[PDB]
Amino acid sequence: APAQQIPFDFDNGNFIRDLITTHGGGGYPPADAMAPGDVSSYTWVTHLLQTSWFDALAPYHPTAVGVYSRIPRRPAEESATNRNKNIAGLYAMFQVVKAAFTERVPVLRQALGALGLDPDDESQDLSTAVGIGNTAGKAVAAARMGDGMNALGGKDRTHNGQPYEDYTGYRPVNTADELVDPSRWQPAVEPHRRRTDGGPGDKGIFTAQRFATPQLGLVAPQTYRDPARFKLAAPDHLDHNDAGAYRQAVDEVLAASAGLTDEQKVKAEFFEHTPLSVTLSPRAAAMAHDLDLDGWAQLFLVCSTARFDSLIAAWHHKRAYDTVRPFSAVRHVYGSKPVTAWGGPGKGTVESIPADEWTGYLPVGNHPEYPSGFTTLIAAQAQAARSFLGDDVLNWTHAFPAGSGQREPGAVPASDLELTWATWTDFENDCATSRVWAGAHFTKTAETSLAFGTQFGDLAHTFVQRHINGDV
Amino acid sequence: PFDFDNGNFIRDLITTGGGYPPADAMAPGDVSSYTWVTHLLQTSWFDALAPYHPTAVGVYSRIPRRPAEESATNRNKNIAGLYAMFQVVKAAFTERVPVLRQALGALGLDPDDESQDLSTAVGIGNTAGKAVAAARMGDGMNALGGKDRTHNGQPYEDYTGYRPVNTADELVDPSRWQPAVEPHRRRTDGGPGDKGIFTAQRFATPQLGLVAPQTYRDPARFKLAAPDHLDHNDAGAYRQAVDEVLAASAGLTDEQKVKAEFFEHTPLSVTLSPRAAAMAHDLDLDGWAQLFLVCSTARFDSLIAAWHHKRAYDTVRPFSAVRHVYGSKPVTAWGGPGKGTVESIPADEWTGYLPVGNHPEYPSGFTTLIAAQAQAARSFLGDDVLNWTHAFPAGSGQREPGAVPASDLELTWATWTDFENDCATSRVWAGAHFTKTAETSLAFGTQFGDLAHTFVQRHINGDV
Ligand SMILES: [Cl-]
Ligand SMILES: [Mg+2]
Ligand SMILES: [Mg+2]
Numbered sequence: 001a002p003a004q005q006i007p008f009d010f011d012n013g014n015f016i017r018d019l020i021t022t023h024g025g026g027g028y029p030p031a032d033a034m035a036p037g038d039v040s041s042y043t044w045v046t047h048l049l050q051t052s053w054f055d056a057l058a059p060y061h062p063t064a065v066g067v068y069s070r071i072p073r074r075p076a077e078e079s080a081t082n083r084n085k086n087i088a089g090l091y092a093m094f095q096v097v098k099a100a101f102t103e104r105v106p107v108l109r110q111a112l113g114a115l116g117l118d119p120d121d122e123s124q125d126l127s128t129a130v131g132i133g134n135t136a137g138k139a140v141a142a143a144r145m146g147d148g149m150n151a152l153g154g155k156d157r158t159h160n161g162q163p164y165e166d167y168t169g170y171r172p173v174n175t176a177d178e179l180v181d182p183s184r185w186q187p188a189v190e191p192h193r194r195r196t197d198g199g200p201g202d203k204g205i206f207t208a209q210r211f212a213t214p215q216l217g218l219v220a221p222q223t224y225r226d227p228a229r230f231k232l233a234a235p236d237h238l239d240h241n242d243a244g245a246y247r248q249a250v251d252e253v254l255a256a257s258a259g260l261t262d263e264q265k266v267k268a269e270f271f272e273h274t275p276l277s278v279t280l281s282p283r284a285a286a287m288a289h290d291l292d293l294d295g296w297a298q299l300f301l302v303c304s305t306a307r308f309d310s311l312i313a314a315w316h317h318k319r320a321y322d323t324v325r326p327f328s329a330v331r332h333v334y335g336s337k338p339v340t341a342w343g344g345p346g347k348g349t350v351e352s353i354p355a356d357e358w359t360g361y362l363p364v365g366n367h368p369e370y371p372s373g374f375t376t377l378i379a380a381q382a383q384a385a386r387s388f389l390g391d392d393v394l395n396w397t398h399a400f401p402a403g404s405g406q407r408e409p410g411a412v413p414a415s416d417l418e419l420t421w422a423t424w425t426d427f428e429n430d431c432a433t434s435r436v437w438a439g440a441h442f443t444k445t446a447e448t449s450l451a452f453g454t455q456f457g458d459l460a461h462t463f464v465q466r467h468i469n470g471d472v
Numbered sequence: 473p474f475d476f477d478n479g480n481f482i483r484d485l486i487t488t489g490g491g492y493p494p495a496d497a498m499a500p501g502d503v504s505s506y507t508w509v510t511h512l513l514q515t516s517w518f519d520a521l522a523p524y525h526p527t528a529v530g531v532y533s534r535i536p537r538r539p540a541e542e543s544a545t546n547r548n549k550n551i552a553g554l555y556a557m558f559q560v561v562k563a564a565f566t567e568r569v570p571v572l573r574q575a576l577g578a579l580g581l582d583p584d585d586e587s588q589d590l591s592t593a594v595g596i597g598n599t600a601g602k603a604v605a606a607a608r609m610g611d612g613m614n615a616l617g618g619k620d621r622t623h624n625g626q627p628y629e630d631y632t633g634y635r636p637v638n639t640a641d642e643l644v645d646p647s648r649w650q651p652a653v654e655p656h657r658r659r660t661d662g663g664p665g666d667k668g669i670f671t672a673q674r675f676a677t678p679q680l681g682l683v684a685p686q687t688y689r690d691p692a693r694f695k696l697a698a699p700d701h702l703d704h705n706d707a708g709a710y711r712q713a714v715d716e717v718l719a720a721s722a723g724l725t726d727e728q729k730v731k732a733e734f735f736e737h738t739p740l741s742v743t744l745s746p747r748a749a750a751m752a753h754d755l756d757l758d759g760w761a762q763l764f765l766v767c768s769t770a771r772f773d774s775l776i777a778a779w780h781h782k783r784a785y786d787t788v789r790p791f792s793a794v795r796h797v798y799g800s801k802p803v804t805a806w807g808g809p810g811k812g813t814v815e816s817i818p819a820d821e822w823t824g825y826l827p828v829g830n831h832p833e834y835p836s837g838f839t840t841l842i843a844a845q846a847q848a849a850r851s852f853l854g855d856d857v858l859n860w861t862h863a864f865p866a867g868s869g870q871r872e873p874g875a876v877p878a879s880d881l882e883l884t885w886a887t888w889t890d891f892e893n894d895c896a897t898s899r900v901w902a903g904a905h906f907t908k909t910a911e912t913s914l915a916f917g918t919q920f921g922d923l924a925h926t927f928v929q930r931h932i933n934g935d936v
Contacts, residue, residue: 033657033667041668103667159821160808162655164668171642176672177635189674191626192665193497194656200664201656203497203567204505204628205830207671208640210653344624357623366669 006114011081015089016053016296019111021283026399028406029275033103035195036273037365039373040213040315041164044149046279047222047308048096048140054301054467055136056092057085057294059126063470064294067222067301069139071132082293087129088136089297090117095137099145148219155215168215170319176208179328182240185211185368186328196269196362197406209366217316221309223459227316232452235323235370237444240332249442250333253326253360256436256443257341258349260361262413266400268361268438269407270419271374271431276398278307278377281427284396285385302384302457302464310380310456314373314449323370326439331356342439345408360439361407372441375449376456378431382424383457388464392423474579477545481553482517482760485575487747490863492870493739497567499659500737501829503837504677504779505628508613510743511686511772512560512604518765518931519600520556523590524549525758527934531686531765533603535596542593546757551593552600553761554581559601563609612683619679632678634783638792640672646704646796649675649786649832660733660826661870673830681780685773687923691780696916699787699834701908704796713906714797717790717824720900720907721805722813724825726877730864732825732902733871734883735838735895740862742771742841745891748860749849766848766921766928774844774920778835778913787834790903795820806903809872824903825871836905839913840920842895846888847921852928856887 008018023029034042055066060079078084094112097104109119117130124138125131145152153161174186187209193201217227224230236242237249256264271277282303286296324332330339334355341358343350367373386392397420405412421427432450435441441449474484498506519530524543542548554576561568573583581594588602589595609616617625638650651673657665681691688694700706701713720728735741746767750760788796794803798819805822807814831837850856861884869876885891896914899905905913 033665035666035669038666038669157818157821159811159814159817160823162670164670166670171639175635175639176674187672189630192656192658192671194666194669199666201497201666202499202502202658202663205499205502205658205676206626206628206630206674207656208651208674210640210670210672213668347623350623353623354621357621359624 004114005116006111008115010083010086013082013086014293014296015086016293016300017283017286019090020093021280023280025397026401027404028273031195031199033200034101034275035199036275037195037362038212039274039278039365039377040216040311040367042274042278043307043311043377044151044213044216044219045100047304048100048144049093050300050304052092052096052137052140053089053297054464055140056088056133057297058136058467059132060085060088061294061468064468065471066136066139067467068143069136071126071135074127074132084129084132085293087117088133090115091121091130091133092137092140094119095134096140099141100151148215149213150215164213166211166214168218170211170214172211172322174328179332181324182246182329182332183238183324185322185324188325188327188364188366190363194363195406196272197409211319212365212367214315214319214367216312217319219312221312222305223309223456223463227313228320230313230452230455232317232321232371233448235321235445237442238323238329238370246329247333249444250326250329252443253436253439254330254339254341254358257358257361257439260342260349260437262417263419264434264437265361265407265412266405266417267419267430267434269405270398271378271434272362272438272440277431278374278381281381281394281396282385285389285394285424288393288395289389298464298468299385299388302388302460303381305463306380306384306457306460307377309459310376310453311373313456314371314376314452315367317371318368318373321370322368323445325364325369326442327359327364330358346411362438362440364440369441370445371452372432372435372446372449375428375432375435375441375446376453378428379450379453380456380460382428383454384460385457386424387457387461392425394421394424394427396421396427476547476550479546479550480757480760481550482757482764483747483750485554486557487744489744490865491868492737495659495661495663497664498739499663500739501660501826502676503738503742503829503841504680504775504831506738506742507771507775507841508615508677508680508683509564511768512564512608513557514764514768516556516560516601516604517553517761518928519604520552520597521549521758521761522600522931523596524552525932528932529935530600530603531931532607533600535590535599538591538596548593549757551581552597554579555585555594555597556601556604558583559598560605563602563605564615612679613677614679628677630674630678632682632783634675634678636675636786643792643796646710646793647702647788649788650792651830652789652791652828654827658827660736661873675783676829676831678779678783680776681783683776685776686769687773687920687927691777694777694916694919696781696785696835697912699785699909699912701906702787702793702834710793711797713908714790714793716907717900717903718794718803718805718822721822721825721903724806724813724901726881727883728898728901729825729871729876730869730881731883731894731898733869734862735842735898736826736902736904741895742838742845745842745845745858745860745888746849749853749858749888752857752859753853762928762932763849763852766852766924767845769927770844770848770921770924771841773923774840774917775837777920778837778840778916779831781835782832782837785834786832787909789828789833790824790906791822791828793906794822810875826902826904828904833905834909835916836896836899836910836913839892839896839899839905839910840917842892843914843917844920844924846892847918848924849921850888851922851925856889858885858888858891860885860891
């Protein structure tokens with residue numbers, strides 16, 4: 001309803017917990033223009049969003065300073081309640097949304113109006129919460145909208161630019177029709193409605209994949225400068241000239257496909273679903289650790305910084321190694337010969353699906369295979385939360401009603417399902433293995449990605465502590 | 473309120489100007505899947521009405537003729553046509569099932585009635601619609617996705633093994649089609665899709681050239697001249713074709729931009745031009761079903777032939793040809809949204825006003841189809857009269873919303889000849905086609921309207 005108001009206690013509430021990250025604890029969130037499996041654009045925009053929270057609250061802190069702005073500190077009385085911090089954080093992310101997520105502006109404008117806040121207030125009075133928030137959010141957008149991500153589309157061109165357009169000149173050595181180098185990434189052919197549950201798009205249209213925002217590997221990281229300094233071993237397990245090792249890596253993917261259970265299917269979908277598994281695991285960790293509003297903003301910043309910097313490094317190596325995905329390797333080893341694996345929707349495991357008709361449980365991501373973006377990112381986020389919160393406790397239970405699976409709706413899971421992760425360690429280990437259940441990654445890739453991501457959580461923790469303490 | 477006895481379900485319900493219709497899962501510019509599914513829908517109308525006609529027989533079914541008293545009013549014919557297309561929707565357009573179920577319920581018809589009593593309108597309609605789907609869902613279009621595979625098939629999947637000789641990144645043969653790189657939200661107004669994702673084009677349903685046509689058996693028998701204007705080894709002719717496209721781009725007016733969008737909007741220009749012709753000729757319900765079948769048959773068979781030649785000639789689109797001729801050099805053309813004509817847009821940053829279609833250039837699908845449809849309506853209705861006016865309020869353009877057109881605009885086509893001539897030239901304004909391609913496509917499509925008229929008359933007369 002146009003006049004409906006949102007109940008929220010500005011004085012004692014927590015806008016991150018009570019407004020932004022609220023959910024019923026079951027199923028998947030509503031869909032919008034950001035596809036849940038598109039981790040690169042998701043991680044980039046979410047970092048702008050969640051950093052604006054921290055920068056908006058920093059002047060209300062006794063010592064903290066912002067990442068992208070330095071706003072003169074407020075008297076302590078302005079933090080006696082959470083009202084100013086709540087207002088400032090909301091306006092800061094509103095500025096980021098207006099700059100980087102214009103699709104969300106109408107819903108956010110309506111939510112702000114329902115909270116009693118003027119959605120057209122562009123004041124930048126630095127003694128007011130709205131002015132601090134607007135200033136902090138604008139500073140994040142001003143520093144990042146023109147970064148290497150090309151989020152506005154103007155990089156290296158003057159006409160007809162499109163947001164997130166690749167300006168780096170990446171070209172695969174394989175086409176979707178011909179596997180010239182079986183060690184190298186090959187674009188998949190996918191229906192235009194390309195999400196796990198179909199999703200938005202055009203009926204009867206097919207496309208060939210393009211490397212998703214390869215320029216991500218070039219954007220300025222938050223805690224370091226050059227992602228090449230984080231060395232990653234070569235993916236020797238996928239050298240097609242070592243036919244025995246290549247075939248073993250393929251057979252492990254097919255065996256994972258053949259062994260799929262309801263729980264593995266749901267976990268495959270869960271860990272690829274960025275607005276749920278990635279965004280809301282810090283919420284679960286925060287709920288288990290009794291953090292105040294400042295602690296939530298700090299935890300989310302440390303997690304987002306870890307995701308941001310680890311994914312840049314993962315994307316750098318994705319392009320440098322440019323590694324083949326499982327579906328191409330399955331076809332390379334077996335051609336049209338039948339294999340034992342998932343037969344497709346409603347089919348369960350079958351003994352004789354032709355290898356060139358096999359597909360992973362989830363639609364394969366549109367970028368090279370090595371390393372795993374999700375696994376690197378979650379390992380970084382798990383380490384960041386570990387370091388900030390002081391322990392490994394996560395205690396996240398999420399419910400999946402019968403038939404709520406997106407790949408096989410109405411059939412998977414066969415009955416109501418509750419998944420629980422007591423620790424980040426359980427969480428990140430499930431993420432890595434679920435990438436193999438999804439058919440998106442080889443076992444060794446997921447294992448190496450787990451080890452590769454952890455270090456970025458430590459860098460993120462140091463970075464956020466430096467800003468909490470005032471950056472002197 | 474719809475009147476079953478004297479009303480017309482095609483006129484009063486299905487095809488009920490200004491602006492563009494609401495968007496759904498079928499993108500308006502995607503002509504191949506649109507024409508295929510629409511032919512099943514509109515053929516089911518005719519087959520449902522044939523037993524209620526004194527002599528007509530169905531295309532995909534033969535239902536024993538009804539007593540004339542059951543055609544005294546339009547009630548049975550209206551009921552039968554609605555259930556017939558409902559059967560096609562359930563088989564070939566499942567996305568539309570909820571809206572149609574609701575529309576039938578609002579009319580007082582049970583959307584769960586699967587009766588096939590051939591003495592009742594619901595039974596005749598259900599039977600006529602199911603026969604169309606049974607005959608066509610497994611044709612060469614691969615609409616269900618099972619062609620030449622047993623696992624993980626996807627509707628409309630290309631089974632033909634077509635691949636371009638160019639990749640989206642490298643133009644090796646400038647005479648041949650090169651797929652474009654496009655944002656995933658790929659429609660003129662953006663459209664549904666995923667933020668921040670780009671794709672390389674795939675030839676849209678190349679198998680369309682292989683599906684069994686309605687009025688002939690082999691599309692190769694319809695000769696189409698070679699696109700000599702696009703032989704890159706003849707640099708002068710190639711550059712002339714390119715420069716004509718750039719000059720059309722530089723000369724774009726509000727009217728040309730809106731007409732470019734209009735003729736690429738299949739649910740409007742293609743679907744509703746027979747409505748305008750039917751309205752201008754005061755046809756009864758039978759005449760509407762017959763006209764739409766002649767038009768749909770002409771579109772179906774002409775587009776099959778166009779798709780056959782699109783694959784055989786596999787010709788380059790203007791954006792690739794502009795890049796071949798000029799590389800990065802500046803040209804005079806449209807500068808992009810909000811910029812108008814500019815003197816120095818780098819050629820490798822130029823784009824047509826509308827997103828280029830995802831199939832080879834020669835011949836033009838829209839132009840061939842409209843020329844076939846225009847001829848079909850001409851032959852059936854006996855004259856060239858169309859008398860269609862469509863309004864575009866200020867700012868209603870999809871490519872440049874709020875700016876184009878600068879003021880309220882009315883487009884009028886008195887005749888099919890004016891309509892098809894505007895369609896051909898608008899493909900050049902759109903940047904999608906070369907001038908000679910549009911001209912040749914107009915000449916190529918006309919013949920399929922004559923074939924369609926003969927085919928429908930044979931069925932109207934009883935197919936003896
Ligand atoms: Cl071919
Ligand atoms: Mg608190
Ligand atoms: Mg009538």
